[PDB]
Amino acid sequence: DSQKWIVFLLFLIVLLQLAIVFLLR
Amino acid sequence: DSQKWIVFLLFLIVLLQLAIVFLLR
Amino acid sequence: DSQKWIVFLLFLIVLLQLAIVFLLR
Amino acid sequence: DSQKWIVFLLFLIVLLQLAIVFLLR
Amino acid sequence: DSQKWIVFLLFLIVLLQLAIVFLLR
Structure with missing residues (x-):
């Protein structure tokens, strides 16, 4: 199922x- | 379901x- | 529909x- | 359908x- | 399918x- 993969990859992106953001500030 | 998580993570990404952007400017 | 929210959020990300990209120039 | 726009946006993001990346290095 | 394209593009984004992150460090 590619839905779980999509959610996992979005979590990694976040x-x-x-x-x-931490690096910038 | 998965759509709720995808929308939520997209909210976090935005x-x-x-x-x-605010840090760059 | 969740697809409309996904498309709109991706538009915001774009x-x-x-x-x-503009601020990095 | 709306999915065609999702991909259209996603690759744009990429x-x-x-x-x-090239704007940093 | 096109979900495969979505996953592939998400992996590229990652x-x-x-x-x-590695360049900035």
């Missing part, structure tokens, strides 16, 4: 975006 | 992207 | 990424 | 993000 | 974000 985590990395938060990492980028 | 908020983080706004944070990134 | 705008925000365009803004990031 | 392209912009690639530009972002 | 790789690009990881490249961003």
Whole structure:
């Protein structure tokens, strides 16, 4: 099922975006 | 279901992207 | 429909990424 | 359908993000 | 299917974000 994969990849994207925000400030 | 999680994570992504933009500016 | 929310949020992300590209120049 | 726009947006994001990478290094 | 395209593009976005995080460090 690709739905669970999509949600997992979105979660990774959110985590990395938060990492980028932390890096900027 | 999965759609709720996908929309919620997209909301989080947009908020983080706004944070990134506001930090750049 | 959740598809409308997904498309709209991706549109917002596209705008925000365009803004990031503009601010990085 | 609306799905065709999702992909259309998603790849766009990818392209912009690639530009972002080159805009940092 | 096109969900496979979605997953593939999400993985590319994750790789690009990881490249961003590694470049910034």
